[PDB]
Structure formats: structure tokens, C-alpha cells
Amino acid sequence: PIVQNLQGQMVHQCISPRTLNAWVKVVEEKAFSPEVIPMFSALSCGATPYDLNTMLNTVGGHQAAMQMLKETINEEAAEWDRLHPMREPRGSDIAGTTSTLQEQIGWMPPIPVGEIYKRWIILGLNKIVRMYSPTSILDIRQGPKEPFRDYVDRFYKTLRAETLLVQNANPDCKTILKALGPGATLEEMMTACQ
Amino acid sequence: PIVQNLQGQMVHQCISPRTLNAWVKVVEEKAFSPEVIPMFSALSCGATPYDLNTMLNTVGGHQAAMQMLKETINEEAAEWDRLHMREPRGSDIAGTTSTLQEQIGWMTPPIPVGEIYKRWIILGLNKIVRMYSPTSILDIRQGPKEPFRDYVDRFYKTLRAETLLVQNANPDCKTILKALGPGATLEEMMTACQ
Amino acid sequence: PIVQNLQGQMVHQCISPRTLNAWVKVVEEKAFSPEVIPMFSALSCGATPYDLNTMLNTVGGHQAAMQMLKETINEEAAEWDRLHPMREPRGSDIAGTTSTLQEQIGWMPIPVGEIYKRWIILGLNKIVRMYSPTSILDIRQGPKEPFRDYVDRFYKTLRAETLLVQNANPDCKTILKALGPGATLEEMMTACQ
Amino acid sequence: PIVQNLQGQMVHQCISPRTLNAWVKVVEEKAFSPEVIPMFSALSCGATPYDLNTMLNTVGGHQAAMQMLKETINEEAAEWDRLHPVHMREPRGSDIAGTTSTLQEQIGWMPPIPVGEIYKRWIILGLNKIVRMYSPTSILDIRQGPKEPFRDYVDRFYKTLRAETLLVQNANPDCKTILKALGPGATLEEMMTACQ
Amino acid sequence: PIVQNLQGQMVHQCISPRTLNAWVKVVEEKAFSPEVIPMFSALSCGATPYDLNTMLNTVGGHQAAMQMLKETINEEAAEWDRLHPVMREPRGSDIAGTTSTLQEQIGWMPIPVGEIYKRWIILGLNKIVRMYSPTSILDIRQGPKEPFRDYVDRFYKTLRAETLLVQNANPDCKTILKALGPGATLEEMMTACQ
Amino acid sequence: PIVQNLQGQMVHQCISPRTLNAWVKVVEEKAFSPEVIPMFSALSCGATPYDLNTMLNTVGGHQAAMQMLKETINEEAAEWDRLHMREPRGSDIAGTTSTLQEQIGWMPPIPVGEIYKRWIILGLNKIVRMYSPTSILDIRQGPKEPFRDYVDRFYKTLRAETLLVQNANPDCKTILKALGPGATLEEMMTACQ
């Protein structure tokens, strides 16, 4: 993070141990579930590229995904270098590889290199989540005795990682969902099959 | 949340990791019990629409309920658009088409877009709790050997999610409850059947 | 709680997550043991009526007791309305039902937070006395039960709600009577050790 | 505790949830082991009589010991009333204990009158009497076993002595022969090293 | 760490119990996995040589590795003594924290004796991790039924402690990886063998 | 610890509950392993003699070691009395016959907190050396024991209290002698892997 000290000068404060421990445990528990992305953006709130690299490097496993994340960052870094031919921050400076912590603080017209690099990380993380999703949306079909509440929970869970809701329901609930007709809210659909 | 910095300027402070972890665990534990609503309003105390979206996005499961919550927010947003620095529209209060600085601008006539959007969330969450309630208040009936204390605990628990208390009691306690007559407090009714 | 900000103005600070989590777990663990009342008064230190309602609403189960607590608060609110016919805080304003957070801070000088806390502790004591399983008359020392444990059970029941010597076993009762009048509890436990 | 606000005024700050939870769990775990007394004085650091009553009231069980503690507080309160006859008002014994005194009065007395440290002295005094009573074994019965290592026997010896020549007397004949050969003026380091 | 007090003087603040407890537990859990190095640099943020020795001394086991770390520090200290022949000038032993007081270390911090000594520790820790790695990169071969995702997870995990990825794959996936040809990203390679 | 308050006056701040709880649990877990000494110096950072006594008194068991620690403190206190606002004597530095304000007063600034901590760490080192089970001469590598583990046990014992090559098994010992003089521990462990 960044803080203005007593003398009014903007200095970098150290990332808290609670933040570091939280980000490590959520990846150990949730791996790459869709809810990991908002937690990262929340835990990395107001972070510098130096701090963002600290949180990513502390991740232990999933080195296949972390290698793919590096490739996506290099692709966005080359795009920044193309669109854009105190010094001007290049793509490698935003990622935090060829830029000091004071330079990153210096750029923060104010250049938010922390939010720009976080945009590249979240963009690369979304691609990993879509890949590591086990089931596709077409295979999510309600069982015979499965409650409609659970089937919709599985349906939109898959859809978050990646008409049709009524098509994959069982014939007992599908008969009820079609009778509701068009313009039925999800509240009315779950209440009808309860 | 919002904080006045050393320079006197209102800046957005990052939501604490304890708040984020607390809100995630309570939803994992309590799902959608009625006591989840007061915990959300407590943990999201003084939050901006940007912060409220962060806490909702970190929720992992229950994507069926979160989709219903989005629909309820869009309905309340359209009502705000009908009844009504730029003026905050319904999508600006929800946090979709408004920056974090704009949301801070309206809060610090002061427009409490955080409390307005929180009112819509609590309104939408109450509808989910009433749906996910398993038993109806008419089906809560005291067993033969069930203590009256436990039956009343189950009675008002269901009533919180959604004369009659005496009607559903067992004939042993019901004989005692009628003898008390009208104007009997709950203290006297539980004391009589102990 | 309440805090004075940098500008000197009294603003409401948000109740900490540790306080909220603590109050939830103690009610889950201890239910309504007598030691829950001092914990509530401790965790709700310097709280506003808005904060007191927040801690009570977070309680999950025990809705029978929470319904009785509401009735006791309404009774104390009506008594405040009778004794007492920026606006004047009525009984419903102190409880936090018909009063904003700024009004409650405004009255705080009227300590609407401590007054409403007095009604809650008053209503909670009535719940603890009801949920106490045993009566003080039934607490009797067993034949082989140590006197230390029997006194632990005796004053535990007495906290929820001469006689100590009467309910003791004939082995310890003979010793306790021999001490005579004016015997401290230290001397009574030391004699039957 | 007490804290000076931004405006320079002495206000009472609320006892932290960590302190309250710590004091509750240590009594649940350790009951009344001698190490509970220094933990109480540490957790109740800079506390007012109002705060000290809060920590004692949060104790769940051991109501027999808490009843004896109240009697010891009343005994020390009567002694304070005698040594200081009651004529900012002068704090009497009941004011120091926190029964007949408001939180502002207790802060007011803090010549500065440390009513918080005085009442804490009475509590620690009363708690020591409970620890000495609840001690199971007496120092005379702590005897080393045949195969018990001397390190463990000394651990049990001074543990009992904390709740309440002789160390050599109660040792087994194998270690006692070695301890007497060392003679007088032997440190505990040399006594434990000799029987290792 | 170092802090400027109210009087403007730079004083050493005590390392937090959370930081010390975190560093102890991560070494007990992870031993010397590659992700321990970024955690050390994160927990020891802005630390003095006195603080760095405190964190290293609190490590209980692994005294063989800690003895190797001391030798690597002595080697880097001798190199500093050579490049810099001897407020006094900080020699190699002063940077390590053996022959220098806490006030002298604060005094030099501008000479970043904390970051210099941390560079030697991370340098020595990398050598320990490379040694304690069990398998070599040449022995990481995909099993017959092992999913490609897991094999790549093991591949880059070993490579982090220490063409070839396609060579060690099973003939079923190797046939697919060669068909992709040159210039294939890791995203395309994992998607092809899913 | 010590803190300068808002008025600029140096007051004693209370030791945190995390510090007290940490020091109690580490002694319960690690007893008197060598790594307990750096943890104590870390947890007692910037502490007064009053604070140092608080951490030592909270230790429950190991009263034999705590009794030896008192004797070592008395020995260092007598040495201070021989070699030497009132002047701090040996008993004042230990915290027995000196108030908390006097200890703050002495902090020419006299660091009575660091002086007394030096005596405690000195006395604790003597306890660790005694409670060490095995001697360095008895640490011998087994037949199938990996050299990494044997060196882990070797320097672990040496921390509590040529020879590394002498006690190795003949398989690794043949390799260690072939390396000759001037071999680093990195080379010795790499050779026997």
C-alpha cells in the first residue's frame, strides 16, 4: 500500500501479515473458484506493483496457472508498449520487473500503475478460472430427485466460471416452468418448483 | 468505508481483512438464516456502493440467491430512476456505472448512496430468507414430550424468517395456556408450562 | 461506539468485528448462564442504542428469550413515557426504534445508550432466572461429593436465582455446626477438606 | 483502563475483547494455578475498579472461590474504613471496591489516589488465599519416586511450594546419597547436575 | 522495522508478534518450499539487520540448513569487505548484524544495510531450496493416466526449486502437443490435452 | 514497554495480550529448546524490569528451571553490587526493590531493562545446556540415516551445548574424507545425497 507519512511525503507501508496470510489460505482452500478474483482485488486494495508481485509470489502451488498468468501479463505489457512508444512507465515498469518501488510510488496527470497492473492480473486470472472449470454449462442437468434450488445453484456456479435453465430441468419441473410462460423472474421459477 | 486523511480530504480506506473473512465465513456457516441480515448491515457499516459490491462478490456459493438479489436491485434501481456534480441515477447507486470517487463525492445536500444501496440489498436479502425458510408457521406444532421452551424457540424462529402459539401446543400445555386467559405475557406462558 | 473525529465533531464509529464475533460465540457457548450478563455489558461498552440493537439482532437462536426481552423493553419504555410526558427522547427513541443514529448521538447529557442498556440487562436477568434448571432448595451435597464441588454448585444456582449447612451431608454438617456462628466460608471449606 | 482523549480530558477506554476473552479462557484452563495471579495483574494493567469488577464478573464457574474473594475484599475494605475515617470526596472502602462509586469518581481519584491499584492489591491478596487452599498436595508429601528423575521431582516440589534441607530429605536414597555428599552451600544447578 | 517517533527521531519499533509467529509457522509447515522465500521477504519488510537475525534465530529445526546459511553470509560478507576496504563505514560483519549495534544499523539507514543483508539471506536461502528439492527436472515424467494439468503442476514446481515439457509427456498427449507445432502457448497446450 | 504520551511524558504502556499469550504457549510447546531464547528477547522487546518479571511469573511449569534462573539473577545482581534520582542497585535492576516509575526514570541513560534482560538470557542459556538430552559426542549417524538428517541432529545438539566427519557412517565418511580439507557444508551434504 501507500501512505502519507508525518512529514507529508508519500512512503510505502508494508503489507500487513493478515493480508498475506489471508491471500495464501484462500488460494489453498478455494484454488481457482470464481470467488477468488474479488477476494484478490479486495485484499490487494491500493497496492503497488511491488506489492502485487509479493502476493502472487507467495502462492505455493498452481505453478502451471502462475506461468500462464505471466504469459498474459507479458501480452498486456507488449500491448502497453505498442500503444505508448520522471520517466514514462513502460509495460515492464507497470508489471514491477524493471522499476523500483520509489518509481512506482512516483507515478502514483497521476498514473495509477497499481490499478493498471491489477487489471492485467485480474484479466489473466479470469482466463485461468474459465479453464479450470470442470463442467460446461451444457452438461449441468437437474437430476430426478434433485431439488430445483440445488440445480440452479450448480447452474449459475458453472455460468460464473464460463431458456437453457428450463431446457435442462427434469420433466416434472420443466412442465411447471413452461406453464409460467415468458417474463418469469427467477423468484417465480424457484417458488413454482418448491 | 470512508475516512478523512491527514490533509482533511475524504479518501476511501480499504475494507479490512477481518471484515471480508467474517462475511465469507458467516455465509458459509449460516447460509441464509435470519440473523445473517443484521451481520451484513454490521460488517458493511459505513460502506460505499463499491465496498458493498466487494462483499457480495466474495460470496462463493448460493449463486441462485445472488441472481435473485441482482434482480431485486435492478427493480429498486428502476424505481429510483422513475422517481428521479451529476445527479446519481439508479445504476450509480448500485455501483455499476459510477466510479469510487463519484460515490465518495455524493456521500461527503449529502446523498448517502451507500445507505440507499444497502437498503436495497437488505430488502432483497429479506426476500431470499423468506423463500429459503423450510417450514411454515402453520406446521410448527409442539410434540407430546417436547418442552414448551423448545417449541416456542422453533415457533418464533420460523416466524422471524416469514393465538396461534396456543393453538399448536400439545393438549397438556394447551389446557394450561387457556386457563391463564387473555392478556398473558410470554413470560407467564413459558413459566406455566415448565 | 462514539468517537470524536479529527474535526472535533462526534461521529459514530463502527462496532468492531471482534466484538460482534465475540458476542455471537458466547451466546452459542454459554446460552444464558449468569456470566453472560457481565460479558454483554463489557462488549457493549460505550455503545449507542443503534449498536445495542445490532448486537441483539445478530443472536441466532433463543428467539423465545429474545421475544421476552422485547416485552421487558416495551414495559420499561412505557414507564419512561409515563414519567416523562433537539427533541425530548421518548421511550421508543431510547430503545432505538423511532430514532436515527444522529439523534441518539445528539442526546449523548442524556445517556440513551446506558439507559437502554439498563433495560436490556434488566430483561436479561429475568431470562437467566427462568432458564436456571435447579432451584436453590434442591442443591444437596451427595455422600461422596467433596464440599468444594457442592459449594460450587450451590452459589452457581444462587447466582441465577444457614441453608448451606442444612443441605450438606451428615459428615460435613456435623463439622459445620461444630464451628458455630460467625464462621467464614474460608473456615467452612477448610474444615470439610 | 484510562486514556487521555484528543481534547486533553481523561476518559475511560473500553476493555479490549482480547483481554476479556483471555481472562475467561485462562480461568477455564488453569482454574487457580499459581500462574493465574500474574496473568490477572498483567491483563488488568492500568484498570479502574469498574474494570476489575468486569473481569471478575465474567468468570463463570468457581463461585465458591468468588464468594470467598468477596469476603476478603470486604475485610480489606473494613480495614481501609478504619485507617481512614470518613468525614472531590474521600474514597471509602466501598468506593475503592467499585460498589458505591461511579466510573467518573474512580477516574477522578486517579495527591493522586490510585484506587485501581489499591483494589487490585486486595484482589491479588484474596486470590492468593484461594490458590493456597485449592493446592491438592502438601510440601511434606512431595516425595521422589524410585525411578522418578530428579528433574521431575524438583519440578513437582517447587510447584507445590509456589502454591503454599527438605528437598534433600524427600529424595530417594540413590539421589539423597549424592546430594549429601555435595555438602552445604550447593546450588540447585549443582544438585540437578549431580543427579542426572 | 524503523519508525520516526513523535519527536522526529528514527527509532526501532519492535517486530510484531503476528510477524514472528507467522515466520515460525510457515517454516514448520512449508520447510523449504520455493514459496518460503517470498514470504520471508514479505514478513521482513523494512527490517534492520538486528530484526533479520531475530527472525532467523527463532527457527527451531533445520539447523543443517541454517549452518549453510551462515556460511553463505560469511562468503558474501568477505566479498563486501574486499570491494570496500575498511559515522563509521559499515563493514561486512556490521551488515550481518554481528559487530554492530541497533543504533548504528539505524544510523546507516543512505546505506540500506537491512536490504543488503536481506539480499545475502535470500541468496543463501535459494541455495538451500535448490538442494532440498527432491526430484530433478529430468525425472518429472507424466504418467499414463495422469492428467496433463497435474503433470505441468509438478513440472514447473520442480523447475521453480531448480521442449522438455513435451518430451516427458505420455505418448497420448505428446502426439497432440507435437501436432500443435511451434509457437504454442501454455494455455493452448493445456487446453489441447484436457 | 515504554511510550511517550501526548503530553510528552514517558509513561509505561501495558504489555499486549498477544505478547503474553505468545510467551506462555511457546514455553508450553518448546519447553527449553534453544529457539526459546531468541523468542523471549523478541517478545520482551523494549521491556522494563517490571515487564520482564511479568513474563517470567506467567510461566506455569518448569519451576525447577525458574528457581535456577532466580539464583543466576541473584549472582549477577551481587556482581553489579560489587562493581557499583538514586543509583540503581542490583535488586533495583531485577525489579524487586524498585517501582515502575523508578525503572522508567533510569531509562547518562541507564538501560535497566536491557541489563536485566542480559541476566535473564544468560541464566536461560545455562538451563538450555542442562536440559539438552544428548551430548555432541553421542550424535552418530545411523547406517541408513540420510546425511541431511544426521547433520540436522548434529548442529541441533551443538546449539544447546572434524567431529562431523568422525561420527558419520563409513559409507559417507569415505566420501567426506575424499573431499579433503577446506570443504564447505554445502559440498559435504551434496556429496552424501
GROMACS .gro file of C-alpha atoms in nm, chain A residues 4-6 8 16 18-19 22 29-30 33-35 38-39 41-43 45-46 115 118 149 152-153 156-157 160 184-187 190-191 194, chain B residues 6-7 12-15 17-18 20-21 24-25 28 50 54 56-65 67-68 71-72 75 127 131-134:
model
   70
    4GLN     CA    1   0.149   0.983   0.350
    5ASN     CA    2   0.387   1.000   0.646
    6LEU     CA    3   0.400   1.268   0.916
    8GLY     CA    4   0.370   1.479   0.420
   16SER     CA    5   0.010  -0.650   0.671
   18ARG     CA    6  -0.316  -1.061   0.792
   19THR     CA    7  -0.340  -0.969   0.423
   22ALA     CA    8  -0.541  -1.440   0.400
   29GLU     CA    9  -0.875  -2.361   0.009
   30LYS     CA   10  -1.060  -2.232  -0.298
   33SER     CA   11  -1.306  -2.076  -0.783
   34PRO     CA   12  -1.469  -1.762  -0.930
   35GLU     CA   13  -1.493  -1.602  -0.584
   38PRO     CA   14  -1.300  -1.050  -0.592
   39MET     CA   15  -1.104  -1.154  -0.283
   41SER     CA   16  -0.896  -0.732  -0.571
   42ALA     CA   17  -1.017  -0.673  -0.214
   43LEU     CA   18  -0.701  -0.793  -0.038
   45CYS     CA   19  -0.665  -0.279  -0.232
   46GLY     CA   20  -0.445   0.023  -0.303
  115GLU     CA   21  -0.459  -0.036  -1.075
  118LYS     CA   22  -0.407  -0.521  -1.119
  149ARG     CA   23  -3.283  -2.492  -0.565
  152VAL     CA   24  -2.995  -2.363  -1.008
  153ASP     CA   25  -2.709  -2.326  -0.760
  156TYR     CA   26  -2.514  -2.032  -1.219
  157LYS     CA   27  -2.200  -2.155  -1.043
  160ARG     CA   28  -1.994  -1.771  -1.341
  184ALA     CA   29  -4.090  -1.513  -1.536
  185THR     CA   30  -3.841  -1.398  -1.274
  186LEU     CA   31  -3.604  -1.639  -1.104
  187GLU     CA   32  -3.801  -1.579  -0.784
  190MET     CA   33  -3.781  -2.128  -0.779
  191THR     CA   34  -4.110  -2.078  -0.593
  194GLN     CA   35  -4.053  -2.595  -0.437
  200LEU     CA   36  -0.430   1.392   0.735
  201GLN     CA   37  -0.485   1.665   0.475
  206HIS     CA   38  -1.166   0.567   0.067
  207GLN     CA   39  -0.996   0.333   0.312
  208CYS     CA   40  -0.965  -0.032   0.221
  209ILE     CA   41  -1.205  -0.281   0.378
  211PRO     CA   42  -0.935  -0.843   0.603
  212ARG     CA   43  -1.124  -0.926   0.923
  214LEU     CA   44  -1.401  -0.971   0.448
  215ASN     CA   45  -1.318  -1.300   0.621
  218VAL     CA   46  -1.740  -1.505   0.399
  219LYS     CA   47  -1.747  -1.745   0.695
  222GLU     CA   48  -2.067  -2.046   0.471
  244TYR     CA   49  -1.806  -0.007  -0.430
  248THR     CA   50  -1.696  -0.626  -0.299
  250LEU     CA   51  -2.133  -0.955  -0.227
  251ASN     CA   52  -1.891  -1.068  -0.499
  252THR     CA   53  -1.675  -1.254  -0.245
  253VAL     CA   54  -1.969  -1.487  -0.169
  254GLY     CA   55  -1.887  -1.822  -0.327
  255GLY     CA   56  -2.198  -2.038  -0.341
  256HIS     CA   57  -2.568  -1.954  -0.333
  257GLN     CA   58  -2.545  -1.815  -0.686
  258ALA     CA   59  -2.919  -1.877  -0.732
  259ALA     CA   60  -2.989  -1.638  -0.444
  261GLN     CA   61  -2.901  -1.383  -0.905
  262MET     CA   62  -3.233  -1.311  -0.734
  265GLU     CA   63  -3.297  -0.878  -0.998
  266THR     CA   64  -3.429  -0.712  -0.682
  269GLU     CA   65  -3.614  -0.337  -0.969
  321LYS     CA   66  -3.697  -1.192   0.025
  325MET     CA   67  -3.807  -1.825   0.050
  326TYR     CA   68  -3.531  -2.045   0.193
  327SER     CA   69  -3.727  -2.096   0.517
  328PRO     CA   70  -3.805  -2.471   0.524
   0.00000   0.00000   0.00000
